[PDB]
Design a protein around this ligand. Structure first.
Ligand SMILES: *[C@@H]1O[C@H](CO)[C@@H](O)[C@H](O)[C@H]1NC(C)=O
Lengths: 39, 49
């Protein structure tokens, strides 16, 4: 759904916090807190 | 084995990468979709042919 700048991808899976696009969600997590994007 | 009932057509098969059934394959091939913005078609729109 475009491309994301500022959020790092992680190889994990949680429930959806912020819906981005086709199976991608984003969250504010500690894994120094930052913004991560996952499936 | 489910008591003689054949569920081989609606259960998924690991042969194809998209884990869909036979009837789901027929239902997906029957409807002609007009895209959903998945491949980011602005790059092909820039290359006008
Ligand atoms: C019915 O079941 C048999 C074995 O359980 C299988 O070989 C066969 O392919 C099934 N029928 C269909 C139409 O898939």
């Amino acid at each position: 759904a475009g491309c994301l700048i500022g959020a790092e991808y992680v190889n994990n899976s949680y429930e959806c916090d912020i819906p981005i696009g086709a199976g991608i969600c984003a969250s504010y997590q500690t894994q120094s807190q930052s913004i991560i994007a996952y499936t | 084995y489910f008591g003689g009932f054949n569920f081989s057509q609606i259960l998924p098969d690991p042969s194809k990468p998209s884990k869909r059934s036979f009837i789901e394959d027929l239902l997906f091939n029957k409807v002609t979709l007009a895209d959903a913005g998945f491949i980011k078609q602005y790059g092909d729109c820039l290359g006008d042919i």
